[PDB]
Design an enzyme around this catalytic site. Sequence first.
Site, PDB file in Angstrom:
ATOM      1  N   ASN A   1      24.110  47.376  40.913  1.00 35.18           N
ATOM      2  CA  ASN A   1      24.210  48.610  40.117  1.00 35.18           C
ATOM      3  C   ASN A   1      24.327  49.793  41.061  1.00 35.18           C
ATOM      4  OD1 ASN A   1      24.005  50.559  38.060  1.00 35.18           O
ATOM      5  ND2 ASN A   1      21.804  50.818  38.332  1.00 35.18           N
TER       6      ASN A   1
ATOM      7  N   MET B   1      25.203  53.014  39.443  1.00 37.07           N
ATOM      8  CA  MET B   1      24.918  54.210  38.590  1.00 37.07           C
ATOM      9  C   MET B   1      23.426  54.668  38.570  1.00 37.07           C
ATOM     10  SD  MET B   1      26.609  51.777  35.838  1.00 37.07           S
ATOM     11  CE  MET B   1      26.904  50.568  37.114  1.00 37.07           C
TER      12      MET B   1
ATOM     13  N   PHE C   1      20.863  57.657  36.425  1.00 37.11           N
ATOM     14  CA  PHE C   1      20.301  57.759  35.101  1.00 37.11           C
ATOM     15  C   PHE C   1      21.218  58.571  34.198  1.00 37.11           C
ATOM     16  CE2 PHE C   1      15.538  57.945  36.755  1.00 37.11           C
ATOM     17  CZ  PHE C   1      15.548  56.558  36.912  1.00 37.11           C
TER      18      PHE C   1
ATOM     19  N   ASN D   1      11.632  54.323  28.342  1.00 36.09           N
ATOM     20  CA  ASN D   1      11.521  54.423  29.739  1.00 36.09           C
ATOM     21  C   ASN D   1      11.945  55.828  30.104  1.00 36.09           C
ATOM     22  OD1 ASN D   1      12.615  54.399  32.583  1.00 36.09           O
ATOM     23  ND2 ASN D   1      12.127  52.192  32.469  1.00 36.09           N
TER      24      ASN D   1
ATOM     25  N   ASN E   1       9.104  55.326  35.003  1.00 32.79           N
ATOM     26  CA  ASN E   1       9.971  54.798  35.998  1.00 32.79           C
ATOM     27  C   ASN E   1       9.920  55.702  37.221  1.00 32.79           C
ATOM     28  OD1 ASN E   1      11.989  53.575  37.386  1.00 32.79           O
ATOM     29  ND2 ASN E   1      13.628  54.127  35.973  1.00 32.79           N
TER      30      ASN E   1
ATOM     31  N   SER F   1      13.568  53.101  40.261  1.00 35.13           N
ATOM     32  CA  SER F   1      15.020  52.996  40.301  1.00 35.13           C
ATOM     33  C   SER F   1      15.560  53.609  41.642  1.00 35.13           C
ATOM     34  CB  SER F   1      15.613  53.691  39.044  1.00 35.13           C
ATOM     35  OG  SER F   1      15.652  52.803  37.928  1.00 35.13           O
TER      36      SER F   1
ATOM     37  N   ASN G   1      18.798  54.383  42.816  1.00 40.56           N
ATOM     38  CA  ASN G   1      19.988  55.256  42.870  1.00 40.56           C
ATOM     39  C   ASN G   1      19.625  56.717  42.656  1.00 40.56           C
ATOM     40  OD1 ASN G   1      21.453  52.912  43.210  1.00 40.56           O
ATOM     41  ND2 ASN G   1      21.986  52.720  41.059  1.00 40.56           N
ATOM     42  N   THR G   2      18.375  56.984  42.312  1.00 42.71           N
ATOM     43  CA  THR G   2      17.946  58.358  42.101  1.00 42.71           C
ATOM     44  C   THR G   2      17.248  58.907  43.370  1.00 42.71           C
ATOM     45  OG1 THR G   2      17.839  57.998  39.696  1.00 42.71           O
ATOM     46  CG2 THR G   2      16.520  59.858  40.595  1.00 42.71           C
TER      47      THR G   2
ATOM     48  N   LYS H   1       6.465  51.343  35.712  1.00 43.11           N
ATOM     49  CA  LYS H   1       7.427  50.407  36.297  1.00 43.11           C
ATOM     50  C   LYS H   1       7.629  50.529  37.824  1.00 43.11           C
ATOM     51  CE  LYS H   1      11.907  48.245  35.454  1.00 43.11           C
ATOM     52  NZ  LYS H   1      13.192  48.415  34.689  1.00 43.11           N
TER      53      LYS H   1
ATOM     54  N   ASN I   1      11.590  46.560  38.992  1.00 38.98           N
ATOM     55  CA  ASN I   1      12.926  47.130  39.079  1.00 38.98           C
ATOM     56  C   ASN I   1      13.825  46.274  40.003  1.00 38.98           C
ATOM     57  OD1 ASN I   1      15.025  49.252  38.707  1.00 38.98           O
ATOM     58  ND2 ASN I   1      13.266  50.560  38.230  1.00 38.98           N
TER      59      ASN I   1
ATOM     60  N   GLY J   1      15.229  38.478  37.192  1.00 34.55           N
ATOM     61  CA  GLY J   1      15.737  37.152  37.429  1.00 34.55           C
ATOM     62  C   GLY J   1      15.316  36.074  36.464  1.00 34.55           C
TER      63      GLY J   1
HETATM   64  C1  LIG Z   1      23.357  47.940  35.423  1.00 31.68           C
HETATM   65  C2  LIG Z   1      21.841  48.167  35.429  1.00 31.68           C
HETATM   66  C3  LIG Z   1      21.268  49.381  35.016  1.00 31.68           C
HETATM   67  C4  LIG Z   1      19.862  49.548  35.016  1.00 31.68           C
HETATM   68  N1  LIG Z   1      19.300  50.732  34.661  1.00 31.68           N
HETATM   69  C5  LIG Z   1      17.948  50.881  34.647  1.00 31.68           C
HETATM   70  C6  LIG Z   1      17.287  52.107  34.184  1.00 31.68           C
HETATM   71  O1  LIG Z   1      17.961  53.073  33.782  1.00 31.68           O
HETATM   72  N2  LIG Z   1      15.953  52.177  34.226  1.00 31.68           N
HETATM   73  C7  LIG Z   1      15.184  51.152  34.643  1.00 31.68           C
HETATM   74  O2  LIG Z   1      13.936  51.282  34.666  1.00 31.68           O
HETATM   75  N3  LIG Z   1      15.717  49.996  35.088  1.00 31.68           N
HETATM   76  C8  LIG Z   1      17.043  49.805  35.080  1.00 31.68           C
HETATM   77  N4  LIG Z   1      17.569  48.588  35.454  1.00 31.68           N
HETATM   78  C9  LIG Z   1      16.642  47.543  35.902  1.00 31.68           C
HETATM   79  C10 LIG Z   1      16.376  46.461  34.915  1.00 31.68           C
HETATM   80  O3  LIG Z   1      15.635  47.071  33.845  1.00 31.68           O
HETATM   81  C11 LIG Z   1      15.587  45.301  35.521  1.00 31.68           C
HETATM   82  O4  LIG Z   1      14.316  45.820  35.938  1.00 31.68           O
HETATM   83  C12 LIG Z   1      16.246  44.619  36.694  1.00 31.68           C
HETATM   84  O5  LIG Z   1      17.648  44.555  36.447  1.00 31.68           O
HETATM   85  C13 LIG Z   1      15.681  43.196  36.888  1.00 31.68           C
HETATM   86  O6  LIG Z   1      15.893  42.347  35.743  1.00 31.68           O
HETATM   87  P1  LIG Z   1      17.120  41.339  35.536  1.00 31.68           P
HETATM   88  O7  LIG Z   1      17.017  40.488  36.822  1.00 31.68           O
HETATM   89  O8  LIG Z   1      16.797  40.565  34.354  1.00 31.68           O
HETATM   90  O9  LIG Z   1      18.366  42.179  35.375  1.00 31.68           O
HETATM   91  C14 LIG Z   1      18.983  48.428  35.462  1.00 31.68           C
HETATM   92  C15 LIG Z   1      19.563  47.231  35.878  1.00 31.68           C
HETATM   93  C16 LIG Z   1      20.940  47.052  35.877  1.00 31.68           C
HETATM   94  C17 LIG Z   1      21.503  45.725  36.296  1.00 31.68           C
HETATM   95 CL   LIG Z   2      19.531  50.005  40.282  1.00 31.74          CL
HETATM   96 CL   LIG Z   3      19.957  60.035  38.726  1.00 27.54          CL
END
Ligand SMILES: Cc1cc2nc3c(=O)[nH]c(=O)nc-3n(C[C@H](O)[C@H](O)[C@H](O)COP(=O)(O)O)c2cc1C
Ligand SMILES: [Cl-]
Ligand SMILES: [Cl-]
Lengths: 317, 320
Positions: free
Chosen positions: B83, B85, B87, B111, B144, B147, B149-150, B180, B209, B261
């Site tokens: 990822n 992007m 927020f 969140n 949160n 994350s 990317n912020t 989180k 995350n 995962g």
């Molecule tokens: C494309 C993408 C965008 C995400 N955006 C956010 C977000 O805005 N806020 C957040 O707390 N986590 C975000 N996540 C994290 C997921 O909520 C999750 O914690 C992480 O992907 C691990 O779970 P998974 O292995 O099942 O994807 C994002 C993950 C992905 C792949």
């Molecule tokens: Cl991310």
């Molecule tokens: Cl951001």
Amino acid sequence: VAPVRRLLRRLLGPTDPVLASTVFGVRFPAPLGLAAGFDKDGTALSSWGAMGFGYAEIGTVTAHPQPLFRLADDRALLNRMGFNNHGARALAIRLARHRPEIPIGVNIGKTKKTPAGDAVNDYRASARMVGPLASYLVVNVSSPNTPGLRDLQAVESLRPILSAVRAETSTPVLVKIAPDLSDSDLDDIADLAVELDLAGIVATNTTVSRDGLTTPGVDRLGPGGISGPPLAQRAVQVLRRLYDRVGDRLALISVGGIETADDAWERITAGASLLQGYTGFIYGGERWAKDIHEGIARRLHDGGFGSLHEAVGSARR
Amino acid sequence: GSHMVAPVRRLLRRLLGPTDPVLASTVFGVRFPAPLGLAAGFDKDGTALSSWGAMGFGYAEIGTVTAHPQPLFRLADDRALLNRMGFNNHGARALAIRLARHRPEIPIGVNIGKTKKTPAGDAVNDYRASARMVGPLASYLVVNVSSPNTPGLRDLQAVESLRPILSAVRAETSTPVLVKIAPDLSDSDLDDIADLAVELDLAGIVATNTTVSRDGLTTPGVDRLGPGGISGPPLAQRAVQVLRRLYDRVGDRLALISVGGIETADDAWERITAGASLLQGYTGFIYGGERWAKDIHEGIARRLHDGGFGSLHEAVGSAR
Ligand SMILES: Cc1cc2nc3c(=O)[nH]c(=O)nc-3n(C[C@H](O)[C@H](O)[C@H](O)COP(=O)(O)O)c2cc1C
Ligand SMILES: [Cl-]
Ligand SMILES: [Cl-]
Ligand SMILES: Cc1cc2nc3c(=O)[nH]c(=O)nc-3n(C[C@H](O)[C@H](O)[C@H](O)COP(=O)(O)O)c2cc1C
Ligand SMILES: [Cl-]
Ligand SMILES: [Cl-]
Ligand SMILES: [Cl-]
Ligand SMILES: [Mg+2]
């Protein structure tokens, strides 16, 4: 005396007559047959009896043509293949040109390219093409490597499939189910099978769970069904549930983790009219079927049983 | 003329929802009909609220959302995602309108994260504003601070900066508040963060995350796909070991939500049994589709019966 014995064996076959039974109208000389997915296209049909199988289940075969890791610490296998086969029509042509000396079941499954909502007519067409020649037909809705296939076990989807297959042919029709179904799914499929007047249920296909495996580096291996002793507990449990519910109304074929004559006898006694194995044959060799059968014949003779049938379900009455 | 029971089970599911009642639990006073939820980041703006039950989810976490409006690579060999992007969202105000319009069904968490422009020495008042807006309508709120990317966000996990954020938010609403966390935290910071959450009487911790690590990847050429967080199976190892640590240390005192995962029913049962009261997924839904969640729930049910657990709660933490 050997010269005579060699003529007797050659003339009558390799299994004790005490093993013989009729199940859904078909004479099976012995109860352990080869499970589906080994002789996929019916290329060894005349070999199976000489190897001490009572029958063999050929397939899975599909309405159109569509042309494996040992897990030795678990005496198990992980299957990575889908339904590779030359199609139901090809098999019918082979079967017409004979016609082995033991029963041949045919196992049919949805062609991969067929959409789910067109599944009914894909099963129908396979059943129409091979049913006349098959000793019995089994609708496989339980193999995990065919995308969406397990979903067809939900009764709303299953009914029309089973109804179409069963109206197509007077060849006995059975259904092959997954080991991981809920109790209520098992009860409902059982009741549906009775309601549609099917001949029986084959339990169980492979599992997708890897829980319990010792073999190292199993994590690394990709998706696929697990066979062998990992299934044994569930397969017996599922057998006993079905037998208690519906065992007076149709036949049950038990498959999953049968390794030894003791395993096999427990299944008979728990309500299995017939048996299959795949994994134990691979780990066990030519002997394997023939040793299991001598083992069952001994237990029938030793117990008071005049015939196999008399023993079926005998631990539950 | 069928004497089958299936038609009545169909009515039961129609009246009560699709999931086996055994999967139901209460966690921070909210009834979750089933434990696998949609993880944050997928429904950023509460745009598909009425659709998530139907996908097989037990709840959905929506966002991240920020106090002000601010409107990926498939790593196929790893069944993972990268990822890039940040927020992007329409802001907490807009989301509150959607939440208030939504006829219930499954719990909806929200969140919240800091608005990008906002200084950082001003993060508190941003989090507070968002909490004020969505707090009243959310089943739960998550802070949160994890994350990647912020710019500057993961620095907020420092107990010294985290304390006044979690404390302002916890003080703003009576809605359960969770935090989180990133998987990349050191084990010592993990213990202090867990201790802070308990200290401030938070409702739980969401772990984990995405990771910035590039270790363990099978897909070729990841090394120049550029920066961003990785999700999916590569997190699983770290997600399980954070989960076990937290549950061992602080599992009596608040709820643990495991994410990172989870692909299969086996993966999910393992988390439950290691002490997750609830779970989430994102990557696994992208790969496994409309079915995926439904498949995880039916596997948990089967293992609960197996079992013979009378309710999901009884199995949480049973491995420890
Ligand atoms: C494309 C993408 C965008 C995400 N955006 C956010 C977000 O805005 N806020 C957040 O707390 N986590 C975000 N996540 C994290 C997921 O909520 C999750 O914690 C992480 O992907 C691990 O779970 P998974 O292995 O099942 O994807 C994002 C993950 C992905 C792949
Ligand atoms: Cl991310
Ligand atoms: Cl951001
Ligand atoms: C490598 C392999 C391929 C299989 N292919 C099929 C198949 O095409 N159709 C089917 O119904 N079952 C198939 N099975 C399932 C077996 O027929 C059987 O139900 C399962 O392996 C349990 O028996 P076992 O423990 O004695 O192996 C396959 C199993 C294995 C191991
Ligand atoms: Cl296939
Ligand atoms: Cl398989
Ligand atoms: Cl409105
Ligand atoms: Mg401390």
